[PDB]
Design a protein around this ligand. Structure first.
Ligand SMILES: NS(=O)(=O)c1ccc(Nc2cncc(Cl)n2)cc1
Length: 276
């Protein structure tokens, strides 16, 4: 729009390009998302879901039959910071803090029946104060890596539990500095999950064999021990990770119960060292 001035492209998201821009009135620096009546109304509902761990939706501009979303701007995403930190890894107290703030954002959005659906490191925004915020939230109203097994098996009516799964994938990833389930198609994603966690069955996930894309021809893999999966994570963290990675979405821990997990007993808020 004319009221703005792109400083630069800073992403191509699922929903079109993303720009750093300045408001020519306010002088504020914002993130500008160009999209590409229900989308209009649901959008403007999103403008009210405000919280410290949720990137603020500043303004929704429907003009010339286009739809720009103006967000509070942050300088770094977690993918970038994770690469920057690949040599020693993010320190555990900072992994823990990030995990805890994200679970707060999730808890908050979930309490309004709003879900993200597409969590992944690049949607996770960090600042110099040691905060981390969830961006893009509620707008599904290429990466398969963080996708919950119920989405993969063709569940159309999935829950908040899907975000808990993605965040569990991102938690593991921060700890080990490798992607947990780097699938490069839908079946390969599914089968990577099966190989680590065991092919699910009616015992561990009642109803699984009834899902749309479940095939009885699925190979049957035995589950691996978590000590092998996310070392050198302590038994608190692994415990918590296993409850986030439950197959049954009704067994999977809520963001709210996860906040009360013993892992979080010694949580602090360290500050990262960022090169902006
Ligand atoms: N430079 S970076 O890769 O860490 C990066 C890339 C894109 C964005 N995008 C952004 C910034 N503020 C708000 C929103 Cl919604 N998106 C940030 C950092």
């Amino acid at each position: 729009m004319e009221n703005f001035q792109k400083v630069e492209k800073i992403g191509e998201g699922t929903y079109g390009v993303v720009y750093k821009a300045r408001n020519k009135l306010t002088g504020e620096v914002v993130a500008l998302k160009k999209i590409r009546s229900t989308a209009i109304r649901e959008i403007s509902l999103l403008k009210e879901l405000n919280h410290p761990n949720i990137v603020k939706l500043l303004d929704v501009i429907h003009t010339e039959n286009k739809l720009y979303l103006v967000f509070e701007f942050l300088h770094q995403d977690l993918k970038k910071f994770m690469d920057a930190s690949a040599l020693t890894g993010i320190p555990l107290p900072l992994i823990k803090s990030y995990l805890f703030q994200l679970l707060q954002g999730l808890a908050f959005c979930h309490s309004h029946r709003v879900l993200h659906r597409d969590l992944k490191p690049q949607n996770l925004l960090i600042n110099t104060e040691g905060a981390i915020k969830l961006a893009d939230f509620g707008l599904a109203r290429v990466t398969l890596w963080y996708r919950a097994p119920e989405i993969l098996l063709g569940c159309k009516y999935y829950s908040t539990a899907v975000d808990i799964w993605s965040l569990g994938c991102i938690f593991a990833e921060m700890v080990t500095r490798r992607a947990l389930f780097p699938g490069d198609s839908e079946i390969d994603q599914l089968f990577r999950i099966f190989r680590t966690l065991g092919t699910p069955d009616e015992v561990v996930w009642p109803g699984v064999t009834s899902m749309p894309d479940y095939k009885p021809s699925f190979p049957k893999w035995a589950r691996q021990d978590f000590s092998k999966v996310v070392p050198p994570l302590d038994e608190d963290g692994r415990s918590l990770l296993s409850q986030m990675l439950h197959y049954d979405p009704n067994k999977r821990i809520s963001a709210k119960a996860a906040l009360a997990h013993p892992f979080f007993q010694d949580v602090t808020k360290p500050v990262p060292h960022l090169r902006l």
